[PDB]
Structure formats: C-alpha cells, structure tokens
C-alpha cells in the first residue's frame, strides 16, 4: 500500500512462528504498521493544521498519507504524482471512503504544480525528494506555501561526513533510477528557498528494523542489502526535516 | 556556577516545603541539576570523541562544561572567554581536580582563536552565540574543526515564523547587551560555513520549567518574565543544533 | 503630526523664556520645524519627479510627507500604513486640502503592495524601515519602481563598526517593538535588490539637537536617553540613503 | 597502462582477422592508441607551457600523461594519486627513462596538495574528477595555479538537459564507487573558483568507438554497456573543458 | 546585408586581380560568404530544431539569420531589434520570399520581449550581446526558453587572462558605443541564469582573415585596426558559446 | 604634480587677464589648488587617524597625498605604484622634507601588497581604482585594513541609471587604457568585501569647473571633452565613497 518506509521496533511477538502459513501475512502487516508509524510521525510535524487549511503531498503514491492527514486534521489534501494509475486508485479510494470532497490526487510534476502562491498551509515529500532537483522542488513548495507555513520531508540522504556517496548509495540510485542527495544539499537548498528547519532528526536507527525484517520476507527486491549496509556504516541515513516557510 | 540554562521537569518533591529555611538552597540546587542535564544533553551530541581528541568551548564561562566533557571522554578541552576572572577560576578549579593538564581556559575572543586549522574534533557555543556575529563565529569554528568534526550549539533564537523579533526578545537583548539571532540566521550561517545540521531540536518546552522556577527564587534579575512570555507565545525559542564540519 | 524625526540646529531665540506659559507650545513647534526640514531634505533626494509621476510612501503615518511631496512636485502620491486611523486621517486631510485626487493613503503591508511592476517613479521609507525585513522591503520597492527610479530612506541604524548592537539600540527596539538594522545590512540588502546608493549621508550630528530638545519637553516618552547616548558614543546613527533602481 | 579512456575512430585494418591468435593483442594496442590520442588532445589545450614551468596531474594513475607532458614540453611535472603502487611504478618508470629529475608522482589527496600558491603553470584532472567534490578540487587547482594559468579536465558527466542522472550513470557510479557530476556542476564550480572555460568540447561521438571496441575484448569488466547506452541516449557525455585561472 | 562578422579562410582565387574594376564587388561578396559561413556555424549549434518550434533572434538586424534558420529547419522565427527600419526591411524581405507567415521582426528591447515563458525552443545573440547587460539578457532568454532549450551566442569578448580590457577593446567600445564583456562575465552570467555551456569555441583565428580582408576594402570604417591588433595580441577574442537551458 | 583631479569653484579673480604672459602659470596653479582641495576632502573622510597609525595609498603617483596625510595626522604612510620613477621621486621628496622615516613609496601591484593582515588604520584609491578589478582591490584593502578601519575612494564611474557606458566613458577608457566601472559595481564589490559605505557623495558638479578650466589651458590632452560632456549628460560621475572595514 505505502510507497514510503517504516520506523519503530519490530513486534516479534506479533510475527509469531516463521513456520506458520500465515507468517508472511503477519510480516507484511508488520511492515505496514511500521510505515503507518512513519507517516504518523511525519504528520506530528505539520503543525496545528485545521479543517479549513489545504495540504499538499508531493509524490503522493497511492494517497495513503493524504487519507491519514484528512482523518487527523479534517482539512483539504491535494496530492501530486506522475502515475495515472496511482492517482486513479487514490481517488477511487477517497470516493469509497466518502472523503473525495476533501482528498484528491492528480497527475502532475511536483516542480510545476497548479496551486496558487501562498495558499497552502503545509506540504511534504515523503520518500519522493530523492527523485528531483532539491532547489527546484523546495522553490516550488516555498512558492505555494503561505508565509508561516510548514514543510516536512522524510528521506534517505548520503552523509557528507564520510565524503562522496558510497557504492551502496549508488546501488540504490541505480535500482530506483533516482538521485539521492547529500544531507548538505538538503540544508543548503532549504536555506536558499526561505525554508528554515525547526526539526532535523536522524531516524536511521529507527528504520533499520523495518529493512532487516523486509530482507527476510518474500517482498525482497534485492536492494535491501544496500540499505542495511549503508545505514550501518553511516554513509546513508534516514532523516525527517520539518521547516518553516519564512 | 553555570552560565547557561537548564532543561527538564522540576522535581517538586525535592524542593519540599517553601516555608523551610533551606528551600532556597534546594531550589538553587534544582536549577543547577537542570543546567547539568542541559550540558549533558549537549555532550550527547558531540559524537564519539576520544582521549586523544581536542575539544573547544567558545564562551566557556567558569569551565563547568569543559570539566564535564573531560570526565566523560577523557580528552583535552580548550576554553575561551573574555573574562580573566572566569578563566582564572576555571583553571584553579582544574588544578584542584588534577586535570589542568587536560582542561584549560584562556582569555581570548572566540572570533580569532589560537587553535590551528583542522585540529579540533568537536566544539560548541553553549548560550554564548547570541553575543557574536554568527557567520564570523561559525567561520572560525569551521576553520579549526577537522573535516568530519562536530559542532554543537544550544541557544535562544527568535522565531522568524512570527516575523521580526518581539519586544520580549529586545528586552532580553537590552538586559544582557546581546544580539539574539533568528533561527533563519543560524541555519543560513551554518550552510555558508560548511556546517551541516545533523540534529535540530526545539527545547523550549523543556527549558520553561527552569525559568518558571527561577522566577520564584531570590535569584531573579528581572528578566525571567521576558523569557517565559516569549517562550510561551512562540516568538523566542531554545534550541540545540548539532552539525558536521564537511 | 509627523512620525519621523528632525534635523537642523535649534532656534533657541524662537523658544524664548522657558518660564513663559507658551514655551511648551513654541518647543513643539520647533520640533515640528526640524521634522519638516527632515522631510524636505528627503524630498531633495527624490530626483526630478514630475506632475505625471507616481510616488510611494511606505509607512506613511499621517501622510504629511505625501502632502509635502505633492505640493512640491504636483505628482500623484500613494501611501501605505497598517493603521486604519492614520490612513483615514491622511485622506480626510487630503480632501480638506482639495488634493485627495492626487494623494491617498491605504491600509496595507509595505511588503506586498498593490502597485504594478515598474510604475512608480520614486519611493521611500522615512523612519519606517526599522520595523521590517530589509531584503523583503527593498525587493518590493525594487519591484514597483521603474528602472531608473529613485528610492530614499532616512533611518536609524546601528553602526557595525563598533560590533554588535549596543544596549541603547536594544532599548529602542524594546520601546517601539522594532528591529533596528546595522548599516551593513542596509547596504547589502540594497545591492541584492538592484538598488544603487547615489548618496549616503550620516545625519547624526544634525538630529542630535532635536532629541536633546525633546528630552526637555513634556513630550518625553522615556526613550530619548537611549537615542542621545547611542548617537553620542557612535553605536547608533541617523542616515539618509538615496539609491537608483537599476 | 592508462587509467583514462580514448577518442578517435578505430583502425579496423590494423585489428585484422578476429580469428588470429594475436587479435586480442592488436586490440589492446588499438585501445592504447586511442587513449594516447586522448592524452595528446588534452595536452593540446594546456597552452604554451615551457621548460621552466611546473605542471600538476591530479589523479595521475601510472604517470603516463606526465611522461607525455615532459617529453612534449620539457617542463617539470608533479603527479598526485592515492595509490602507493601507482606512484611507485610511475617513479620507477621515470627513473628508467632518465627523467625522474623532471617527473615525479607522490601519494597525496588532490584536495590538499603541497604545491605553493600561484606556482603551477597548468594542471589537469583526466578521468579523475568524477571521484571528488568539484568545488573543492577546483578551489585547490585555483590555489596553486598562477594567475593566467591553464586548467584542463577530460571527464564523463551526466547531461542536465535530460534531468536527473539516468540508471546507466548510477550503474557507473556503483561500479567505480565514484560520483559522476552533471555538466551544470562542472561549469558552476569553475565559475565559483575563478576558472573561466576557454574551450568546452563534447567528445562523446569520439569516445564511443573506443568503448564498443572494448566491449568485444577480453578486457570487459561488465560496465561497458552502461557507458555505451548512456553515451547513445545522451544522458551521459564525455567532455574536455580547458579553462584559464583569472 | 549582415550585421555580424565572418569566419573561414579567404578565397583569394575568387578575389582575382585587385586591378579589375570588379575587384571591390568580388571582395564584398567574399566578406558576405564568410559571414554566411558564420551564421551557418551558429545554426549548427541550435540542436535538432523542428518545423513546429519557435526560434528567437535577439538583435536580429536585417533578419538574414532568421531567413537562414527557417529555410534550414522550416520552423517559426521571431526577431527583435530596436531599429524600425531594420524590422521593416526584414519583414518586407520575408513577404517577398513568401515566408512572412514563419519569419517576423519587431521593434522591441531584447531585455523585455513579449514571448511567453518556456515557449521558445532555441534562441541567440549574434554579435548583439556586447550592447547589453549579460545577466539581464541571459535572464530573459532563460525565461522564454523551454527547459532543455538551446541558447547560442557568437560574440567578441575581452580575455580576462591578460587582465583588464586593452585600449583596442575600449576603442571598439567607443566606435560602436557598446560595452564588450570579458569572457569571465559570459560564463558567470550563464551559470547564474540556468544556462549550461555545451560548446565553447574560440573562433579568433577563423575571423582574422575576414577583418584583414575588410581592412583592404572601401568598406573600412577605421575600426578594423583595433579588431585585428587585439585579436592578434590575445586581449580580444571571437567566440561561440552554445548552452542548454536547464 | 598631482595625478588625481580637483573640486571646487574656480577663482577667476586669481586667474586675472588671459592676455598676461603669466596667465598660464596662474591657471596651472589654480588647477593645483583645486586638486589639493580634493585630496584634503578625501582626508576629511579617513576618520581620526593618529601618529601611531599606518595609512596606505594605493596608486599613490608622486606621493603628494601621502605627504599631506602625514603633515595632517603625523602618522606613517605607505604608498604603492607601478612606476619606479614615481616611487623614486616621492621618496626623494620625502627625504628632502625630512619625513622619509614616516612616508615611503614602493613599486608594487595594489592587488598583492606586502602589508600584514589587519595592520592598516585607513587606506584609499584616489583616481586609481578605474584601472583594476574592484572585487580584487577591495579584497586586498579589506585584508590589510584593521577591523574598524576606514577605506576611501575618489573615482569616476559610469552611471548605471542611464544603462550601459556611454561613448564618452569608452573614449576615456581608450585614452588612459583603463576600465571605468559603474557605480553599481563599486557598491557591490564593497558589500562583498566587508566594506560598508559611511558616506557616498556625488562630486560631479564640484569637479566640472576644474575640467572646463583645464580645457582652456595648454595642458589639454584632448580628453577633456569626453569628461565634460559625460559629466553633463549624467552618464559619467565623480564620487567619493568612505567605507568602514567591518
């Protein structure tokens, strides 16, 4: 369901015996529970959003975070993705839940959205910033975000502390055909776009259990080794940055 | 003893009856305990500093954080202050503890220190950055800090989210004859000086109990109202920023 | 009447005997005369503005400078203030003078005005820039000012030559709940916004008599000591900067 | 022998019959001939270097370009590599040729070399810039290069015209554990370091034959497909940039 | 006919005997042939422009390059000049050729054109950039150029390698009342406006024959000595820069 | 004697009858008197320099301003010129006056002087900045100037208000083989080098009489028409900028 990753300790008690026929079903559910905790945590950083505010999810995938945002704040949520299938599923889902009047996904590039200047209360990129130019996406968020608005991103980034990106990070780039940025670029791009971090938290230790668990599932895609190893040697990190549009 | 402030819930049980003659003595001790928790927390962000590393405390006051740093990591600690009395006390103290061969304070401006380029493992400004130009002090820290080194600052800063600095912040500036900077300047100055935040945490809710407690003591200086009120309306905030020199 | 300050030597002969019952009335009139000389001097720097040009007064107060500008150049003058009372008074005044078809005040933030790009011949901030972000206000002036237009500001600013702002400057900030900027920021902000100083003149010696005089009047608000002392030790200065929009 | 790549049409006549036992030996020699043409072309862009000038090769590998430079200009050549084996081989080689008094390799990081400010006439990175931060390496070259000196680089870079780096580029990064930069970064980094391009030439069409040939040899390492495909779809390009230190 | 200059070796055989009465007519034709080769070369750098694309010629003169562009690509071509006579001639010419539905010139400043954002495929300044501010003209080209579009300029520029501009360059500035820029400014301005050079080629040796030839004609204006001498001592250079709008 | 120009009204009474044989001698003396008033005015902006301070004159010519500076402040004065003859004359002159122990000229480029960082109290470029790169010369002044030091420049600059430099300015560039900068560059370069204008005054009306007078003398060099005409149409201006090193 979710395209982003999870955080939090794994509930091994819930998993039970790996021998059971339903183990894989309890595992996928655990992965899901960790991803929900992640989105929930991202939401904790959006500030006091209200029923009349508009929120924007850049790279919304299936619209799950949008649904969570609305149920939590009762506000309007606009999502953007380049996948027609993802947008369609999200909207069908929204209609079936009877909230399609508040939540909507559309096919559009996150670098040039239809949202008017200063009309969005809060916005975010959950695992979707590693695909685009940071200065350009932050410049767009800074444009539609009202002064005083809140921007949040949960993303993996290489650690400039260990120098250039490790082979593991490059392996991830080649797997998703993305372009993971260094933590230095994230902070620089924000500063250049009137985005001032209020919170920066390294969630690497929190997301490691999610990946080790996934590496033992039938959900493996062959890239979990790059994630785990880079997270462990410190060259790659998972972080949440909450910033104010000033 | 400490020139910086505290964080953490107040132990009212420890305080006891305000009627006792020793209440004031238990209160000052509580304030002290909260300040120690603050320095300890700052230390948790210096990374894995070792016995052979050199640490720099810019605006070290009486040298208490330096003493804590050495006992915790066993490394060398150099402190800088403009107060001859403070430096002298710190060094006497260090000698009496038998660690003057590891810990030393000296009278010097934090904008032009004698430390050689790339020789310091970690450094920090604890409540002392609100006195100097941020670009210049971060440029100096960036100069002596080795590539990969860690810089930490605990400081009060006005929130650019509410616009220009409030009267409360100005009242604080006039009380200490300092120049509190906005959170935007802190992040901008770091980005311009090869300092990349690894952690940014708003400790405002954590330091509020310390000030409310101090406002009921005989330690009042008349400025605690500005602190408390600005911390409450959000115009002023207490934050910890840990950054890597890259 | 005027919200800005004055420049020029005090006419003690005019003041006469402090014992007279009308001394205070002659004093207030003297203060007024010095303020008018100030506005007049600001006007001398607007260039050859004509009857068909449009001028903008950011932070116009009661509209007095606007009235002076029109009578002098016969042009149109648009004023901006956040005070509904001030705007209303200014417009009533304009109507009574029969120039409301040329001079108008409105309630609006000076950072986001309704004036169209490149349509204003000259504009200014008279004692009103110490309240807002300099880059943002100069960016707005630069936007509506035609290429070749003239921008002028008369303002107090702390002197970066003596380092960080003195307690006196902070006391002023706390009194008006403003945010006095250093002279370095004024010049930097202009350079970053296509505003090129044609004239920069330190009027500190010229405005000192105005304040010393006010400090002996019943108009005292308790802040004249901060002004006088900072003007005297050089930490605070009163300057006029006339710049071209290029 | 050479660590960099080649340019120029393949001499199929020279290759002869693939059935011969010596085909592979003629092929490797052809690859070599194309690489020599590349180094020769890089040398054509160093300007009129003379016998008394000093040249620096950053990431010199086995020192082959250095040897070529000396024989061509008779000047002194200093090389830098992180490989002790490579440096040792290069120096042995130089001694055997009787030019070790002019050509020398040493183990050192190209970001912090021992060369004094403004003492080098020309310098270059041949296929070695994709490993380091561009601003930092150009800043170092700009430091030891005399005013008026010449800097040259032959490198692969992703094309910002097609957006973010393609999977092919990422595959190359993962293969060499490097960090290929976009052409935009190359030009930006130079401009920020007083390096002004005099020549920028896309050699992609010229280097394609070298790779297609290598892809049919026993020298294959499995990465030639990424090179060829990205060179063909335009996402990756091979370029020469010659710039003046001004 | 053409306002720009030429490149290529002179066909002395074509010129024939200087004694003939038609020598001057064959010379002017030769100059013309060299100018056409120049425009043709500029066109080779516009990329794969098609019939449905729109091209912009900033400082189009008589519209000759525009005519060439259309016949070559069949696309639409918009030209801008400040000369009403030049625009009128170009359009008459276009009508007579029956291509006025594709090619059009208009009187307009190249710093503020009517072309909509991101609608132009390629654009250029042929010998016309030495008249305007580089940052401003590149900013305008960058505005109407679509992402991925191509910008080309052929221009003379002083060489920052020899320091400040030579007397020869100044003599040229005074002759045309223009403002020749250094090669450093060209590259800097492009980098600041999202224009990334794909090709930079010094055509000085190629344009020298054109000027020496013109210096022997009845077309002399007295400035050919400044051109030739500065081209020869290296202080002035003729270059082509092709860049991508990214 | 002086290489810089003058300011102030011409004393026609002193000139007397143009018919006298000594008219030319009284004229040259008048020109001299106006130049001395200029240097004197520049000196009024150096601040409270004392006997123990060191002053630097970049592009000192014959050392006349240096001599004036010493006699006025009694301080040490170091001069820099590229003319061996000028330096020698200045020093001979200084010795003959018995002040060679305080005033000294030397042959050196003003972009790389031997003065140690932060050791100079005040410095200046009198009519010599139009020859060098502004960022580089201001960066050098900023380097040896102590924090709080004063920098002053009297120079001609083109007015960015009228767009690109006029033919007159170019004619001046060609006459002296210099590179007059726009007023925008002067202010920008200062801001980028920690130089904050304290005074900016347009002396164009004050220097016009000096040039009109010179245009009627036997001292004409043929360039006075460019000066006078550009000063009159506003495209060229003579200004004094006094700035603090902060």
């Amino acid at each position: 369901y979710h395209h982003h990753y999870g955080i939090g300790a794994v509930d091994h008690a819930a998993l039970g015996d790996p021998g059971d026929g339903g183990y894989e079903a309890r595992l996928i559910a655990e992965l899901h529970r960790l991803e929900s905790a992640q989105a929930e945590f991202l939401l904790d950083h959006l500030g006091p959003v209200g029923p009349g505010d508009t929120l924007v999810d850049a790279g919304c995938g299936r619209g799950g975070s949008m649904v969570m945002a609305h149920q939590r704040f009762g506000c309007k949520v606009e999502g953007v993705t380049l996948s027609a299938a993802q947008a369609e599923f999200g909207n069908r889902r929204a209609r079936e839940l009877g909230i399609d009047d508040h939540v909507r996904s559309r096919v559009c590039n996150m670098l040039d959205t239809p949202f008017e200047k200063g009309t969005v209360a809060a916005s975010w990129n959950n695992e979707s910033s590693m695909y685009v130019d940071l200065h350009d996406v932050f410049a767009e968020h800074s444009r539609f975000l009202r002064v005083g608005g809140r921007y949040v991103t949960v993303t993996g980034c290489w650690n400039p502390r260990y120098g250039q990106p490790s082979k593991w990070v490059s392996q991830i780039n080649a797997h998703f055909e993305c372009n993971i940025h260094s933590r230095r670029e994230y902070l620089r791009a924000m500063a250049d776009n009137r985005l001032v971090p209020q919170t920066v938290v390294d969630l690497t230790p929190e997301t490691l259990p999610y990946w080790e668990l996934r590496a033992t599932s039938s959900l493996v895609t062959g890239i979990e080794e790059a994630f785990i190893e880079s997270y462990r040697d410190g060259s790659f990190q998972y972080v949440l940055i909450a910033a104010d549009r000033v």
Side-chain angles (χ1 to χ4, degrees), chain A:
Chain A
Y1 186 55
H2 290 300
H3 65 298
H4 63 80
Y5 307 124
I7 61 173
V10 169
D11 187 352
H12 292 96
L15 267 35
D17 197 316
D20 287 4
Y23 174 69
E24 205 58 55
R26 296 193 295 282
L27 190 161
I28 301 177
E30 175 66 351
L31 256 28
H32 186 86
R33 178 185 76 79
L34 300 178
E35 298 163 335
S36 295
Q38 192 258 38
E40 205 67 58
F41 188 61
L42 183 158
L43 254 35
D44 292 336
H45 296 80
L46 290 181
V49 30
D53 292 322
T54 296
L55 269 38
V56 175
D57 184 331
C60 64
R62 267 180 270 293
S65 295
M66 292 162 62
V67 174
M68 290 179 53
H70 172 60
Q71 304 177 311
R72 185 161 165 181
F73 306 115
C75 60
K76 170 185 286 290
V77 194
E78 291 289 337
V80 148
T81 56
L82 285 59
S83 170
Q86 294 189 299
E88 291 182 294
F89 174 91
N91 291 320
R92 269 178 167 59
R93 198 79 163 188
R95 273 175 274 159
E96 308 171 320
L97 275 303
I99 60 176
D100 59 299
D101 58 306
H102 279 282
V103 175
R104 173 181 54 180
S105 306
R106 74 180 73 194
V107 178
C108 176
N109 180 197
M110 55 177 63
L111 267 32
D112 177 35
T113 67
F115 312 114
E116 305 191 307
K117 182 180 181 175
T119 61
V120 184
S123 61
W124 69 82
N125 282 82
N126 194 342
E127 309 271 24
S128 55
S129 61
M130 60 179 87
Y131 290 94
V132 296
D133 181 82
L134 255 28
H135 180 92
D136 296 345
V137 73
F138 290 165
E140 174 73 344
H141 275 282
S142 187
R143 180 190 66 75
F144 58 60
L145 235 32
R146 108 243 288 203
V147 170
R150 172 60 55 80
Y151 172 75
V152 178
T153 186
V154 171
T155 182
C157 57
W158 49 275
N159 200 334
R161 199 170 90 69
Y162 300 107
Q164 302 294 288
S166 66
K167 65 175 178 182
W168 299 125
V169 175
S170 296
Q171 277 177 33
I172 298 177
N173 287 334
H175 184 79
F176 292 116
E177 183 156 53
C178 59
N179 182 33
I180 292 166
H181 317 286
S182 89
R183 202 178 73 258
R184 180 178 188 193
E185 299 179 64
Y186 271 95
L187 277 295
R188 175 63 179 181
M190 292 194 173
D192 295 344
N193 285 287
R194 304 185 68 112
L195 256 23
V196 185
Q198 161 67 20
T199 300
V200 178
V201 55
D202 186 320
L203 266 19
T204 305
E206 301 303 317
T207 198
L208 224 23
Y210 169 91
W211 281 92
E212 301 170 311
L213 182 57
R214 170 171 157 163
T216 69
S217 71
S218 61
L219 276 57
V220 293
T221 55
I223 192 66
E224 27 295 295
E225 167 181 48
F227 271 87
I228 297 168
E229 295 303 313
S230 62
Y231 278 157
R232 287 181 185 170
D233 64 24
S235 66
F236 189 49
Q237 39 181 177
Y238 199 58
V239 307
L240 166 327
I241 299 175
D244 295 322
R245 158 69 164 82
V246 306

